[PDB]
Amino acid sequence: EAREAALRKELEGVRKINEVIEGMIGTLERAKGNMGTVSQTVTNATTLLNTWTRM
Amino acid sequence: AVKARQLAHLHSQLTQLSHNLATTENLMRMTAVQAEAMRGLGSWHAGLFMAASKVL
């Protein structure tokens, strides 16, 4: 049936979108951890700079 | 001969005197400046290590 063709094509396109979405959310959470590391890094940098200041 | 040697001594004296005074004045003033430069330098580094000790 034409409805089955529409059904399968709908699942195909939406599933491609879902897979891309899954990779996208994974990318974002990876970036979340990266930004956390970034924040910690600069925090430590600031600490060292303050140590230098007192020095 | 006698006065020839007298003035030989005098010429040597005065010649080397001009040399020595040049040496003296120029390098003394220079070294005085160098001394104060080294003074401030070493004092700064001394305090640097002082702060390092307090950092410990």
Curated annotation (Swiss-Prot), chain A:
Gene Ontology cellular-component annotations: cytoplasm; DASH complex; kinetochore; microtubule; mitotic spindle; spindle pole
Compartment(s): Nucleus; Cytoplasm, Cytoskeleton, Spindle pole; Chromosome, Centromere, Kinetochore
Principal subcellular localisation of the protein: nucleus
Keywords: Cell cycle, Cell division, Centromere, Chromosome, Chromosome partition, Coiled coil, Cytoplasm, Cytoskeleton, Kinetochore, Microtubule, Mitosis, Nucleus
UniProt signal peptide: none
Similarity annotation: Belongs to the DASH complex DUO1 family.
Role: Component of the DASH complex that connects microtubules with kinetochores and couples microtubule depolymerisation to chromosome movement; it is involved in retrieving kinetochores to the spindle poles before their re-orientation on the spindle in early mitosis and allows microtubule depolymerization to pull chromosomes apart and resist detachment during anaphase.
Protein name as annotated: DASH complex subunit DUO1
Protein source organism: Chaetomium thermophilum (strain DSM 1495 / CBS 144.50 / IMI 039719) (Thermochaetoides thermophila)
Gene behind this protein: DUO1
Portion of the full sequence shown: 49 to 103 of 232
